[PDB]
PDB file of C-alpha atoms in Angstrom:
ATOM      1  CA  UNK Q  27      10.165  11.101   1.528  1.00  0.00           C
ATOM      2  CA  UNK Q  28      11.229   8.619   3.871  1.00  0.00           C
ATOM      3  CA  UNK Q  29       8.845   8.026   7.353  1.00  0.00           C
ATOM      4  CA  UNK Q  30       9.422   5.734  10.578  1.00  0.00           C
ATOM      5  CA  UNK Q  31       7.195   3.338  11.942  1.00  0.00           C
ATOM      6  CA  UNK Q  32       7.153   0.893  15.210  1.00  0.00           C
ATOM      7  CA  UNK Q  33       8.268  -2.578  13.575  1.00  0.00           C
ATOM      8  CA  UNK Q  34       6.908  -3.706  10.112  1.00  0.00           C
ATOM      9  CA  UNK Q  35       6.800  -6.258   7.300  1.00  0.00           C
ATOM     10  CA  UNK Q  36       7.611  -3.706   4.460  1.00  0.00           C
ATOM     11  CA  UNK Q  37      10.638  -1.344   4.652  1.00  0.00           C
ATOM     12  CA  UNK Q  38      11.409   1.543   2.196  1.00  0.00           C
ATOM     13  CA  UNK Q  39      15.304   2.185   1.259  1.00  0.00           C
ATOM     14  CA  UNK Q  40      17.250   5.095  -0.003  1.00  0.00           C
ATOM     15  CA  UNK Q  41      20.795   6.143  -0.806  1.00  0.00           C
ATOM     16  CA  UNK Q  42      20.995   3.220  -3.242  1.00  0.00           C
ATOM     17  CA  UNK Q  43      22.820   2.930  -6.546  1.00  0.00           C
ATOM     18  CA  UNK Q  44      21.651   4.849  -9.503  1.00  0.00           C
ATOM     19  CA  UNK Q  45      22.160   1.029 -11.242  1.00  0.00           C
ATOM     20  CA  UNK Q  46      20.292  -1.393  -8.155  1.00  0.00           C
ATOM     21  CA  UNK Q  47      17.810  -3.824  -9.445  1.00  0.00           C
ATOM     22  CA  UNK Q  48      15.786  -6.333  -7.663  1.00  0.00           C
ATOM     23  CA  UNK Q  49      18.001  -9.450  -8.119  1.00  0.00           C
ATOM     24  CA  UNK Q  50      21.131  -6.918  -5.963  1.00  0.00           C
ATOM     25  CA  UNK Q  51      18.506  -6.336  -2.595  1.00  0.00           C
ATOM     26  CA  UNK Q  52      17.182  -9.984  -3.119  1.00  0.00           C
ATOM     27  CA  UNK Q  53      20.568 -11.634  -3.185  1.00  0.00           C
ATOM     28  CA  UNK Q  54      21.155  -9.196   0.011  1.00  0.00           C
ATOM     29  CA  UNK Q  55      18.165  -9.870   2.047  1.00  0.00           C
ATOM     30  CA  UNK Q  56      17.390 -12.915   1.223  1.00  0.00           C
ATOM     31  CA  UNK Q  57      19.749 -14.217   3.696  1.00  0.00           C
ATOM     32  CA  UNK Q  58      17.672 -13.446   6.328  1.00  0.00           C
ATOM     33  CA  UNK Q  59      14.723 -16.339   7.279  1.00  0.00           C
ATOM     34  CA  UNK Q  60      11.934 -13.835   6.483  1.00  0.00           C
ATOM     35  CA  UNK Q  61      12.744 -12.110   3.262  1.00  0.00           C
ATOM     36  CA  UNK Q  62       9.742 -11.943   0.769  1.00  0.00           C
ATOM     37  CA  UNK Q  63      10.529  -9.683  -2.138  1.00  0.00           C
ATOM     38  CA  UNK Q  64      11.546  -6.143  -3.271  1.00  0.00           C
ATOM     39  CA  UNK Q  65      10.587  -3.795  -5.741  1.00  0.00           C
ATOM     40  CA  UNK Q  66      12.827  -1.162  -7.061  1.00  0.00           C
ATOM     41  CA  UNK Q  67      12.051   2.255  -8.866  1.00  0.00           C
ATOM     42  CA  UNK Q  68      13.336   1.344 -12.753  1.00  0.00           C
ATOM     43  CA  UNK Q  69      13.517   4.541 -13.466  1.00  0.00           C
ATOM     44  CA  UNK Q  70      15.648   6.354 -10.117  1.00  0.00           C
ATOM     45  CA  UNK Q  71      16.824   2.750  -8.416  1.00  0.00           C
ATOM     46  CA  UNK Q  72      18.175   5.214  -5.659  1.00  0.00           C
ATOM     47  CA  UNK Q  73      15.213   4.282  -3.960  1.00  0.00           C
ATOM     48  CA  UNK Q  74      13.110   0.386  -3.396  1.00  0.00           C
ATOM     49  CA  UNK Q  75      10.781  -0.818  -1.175  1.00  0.00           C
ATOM     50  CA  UNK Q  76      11.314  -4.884   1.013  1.00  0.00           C
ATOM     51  CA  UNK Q  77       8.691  -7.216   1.987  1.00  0.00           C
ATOM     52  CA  UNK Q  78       8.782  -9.555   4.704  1.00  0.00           C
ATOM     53  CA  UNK Q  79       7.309 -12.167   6.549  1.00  0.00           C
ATOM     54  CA  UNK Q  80       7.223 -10.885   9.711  1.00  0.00           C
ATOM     55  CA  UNK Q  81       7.754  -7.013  11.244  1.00  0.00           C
ATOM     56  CA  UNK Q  82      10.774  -8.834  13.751  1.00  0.00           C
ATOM     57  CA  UNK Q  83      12.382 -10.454  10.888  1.00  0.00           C
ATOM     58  CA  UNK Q  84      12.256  -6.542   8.817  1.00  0.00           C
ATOM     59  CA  UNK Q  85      13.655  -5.461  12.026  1.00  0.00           C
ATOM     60  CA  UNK Q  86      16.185  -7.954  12.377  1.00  0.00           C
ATOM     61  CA  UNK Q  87      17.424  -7.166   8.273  1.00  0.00           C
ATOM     62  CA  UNK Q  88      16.911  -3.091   9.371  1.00  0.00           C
ATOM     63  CA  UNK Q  89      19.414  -3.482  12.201  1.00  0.00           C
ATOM     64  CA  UNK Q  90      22.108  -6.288  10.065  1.00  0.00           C
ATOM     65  CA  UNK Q  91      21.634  -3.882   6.771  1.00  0.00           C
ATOM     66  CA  UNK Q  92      21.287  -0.173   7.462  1.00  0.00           C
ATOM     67  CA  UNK Q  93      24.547   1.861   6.492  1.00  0.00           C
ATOM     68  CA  UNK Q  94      25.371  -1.321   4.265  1.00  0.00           C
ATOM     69  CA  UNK Q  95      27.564  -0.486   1.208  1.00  0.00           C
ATOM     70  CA  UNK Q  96      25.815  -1.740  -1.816  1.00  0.00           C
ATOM     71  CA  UNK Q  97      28.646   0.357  -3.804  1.00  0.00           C
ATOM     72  CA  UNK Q  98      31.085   2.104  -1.883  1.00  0.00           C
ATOM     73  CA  UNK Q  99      29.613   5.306  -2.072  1.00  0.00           C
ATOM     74  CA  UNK Q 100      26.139   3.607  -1.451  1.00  0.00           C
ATOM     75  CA  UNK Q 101      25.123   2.942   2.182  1.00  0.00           C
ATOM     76  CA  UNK Q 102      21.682   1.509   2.046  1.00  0.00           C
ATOM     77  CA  UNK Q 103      19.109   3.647   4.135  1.00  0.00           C
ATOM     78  CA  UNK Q 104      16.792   1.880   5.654  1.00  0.00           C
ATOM     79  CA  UNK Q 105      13.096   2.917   7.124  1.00  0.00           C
ATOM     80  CA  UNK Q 106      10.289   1.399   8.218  1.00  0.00           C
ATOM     81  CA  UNK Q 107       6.983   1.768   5.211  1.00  0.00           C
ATOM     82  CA  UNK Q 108       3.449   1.358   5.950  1.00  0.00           C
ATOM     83  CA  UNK Q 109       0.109  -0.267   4.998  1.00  0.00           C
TER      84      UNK Q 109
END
């Protein structure tokens, strides 16, 4: 289940493709100065996790990403994870 969080370097995603792998959310948020990695679920993909540099940066993707189509019917969710 998702949570929220003040700022963080890891964010957990939902409302993703049944089909996203890691090289579709890299090629997305690696356009941002911070990106790190992902790691999907390969076996739902409806779900991943992003890591990030710097809790501002994950912020700053949050903010330019949430609500994003990945597929039409697929606006990424976006939350903040924890450590």
């Amino acid at each position: 289940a998702q949570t929220e969080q003040p700022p963080n370097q890891i964010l957990f995603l939902t409302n993703l493709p049944e089909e996203t792998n890691e090289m579709m959310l890299s090629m997305l948020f690696n356009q941002f100065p911070g990106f790190k990695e992902v790691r999907l679920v390969p076996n739902r993909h409806d779900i991943a996790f992003v890591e990030f540099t710097t809790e501002l940066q994950s912020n700053a993707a949050k903010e330019a990403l949430q609500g994003f189509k990945i597929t039409p019917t697929h606006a990424m969710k976006i939350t903040f994870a924890k450590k």
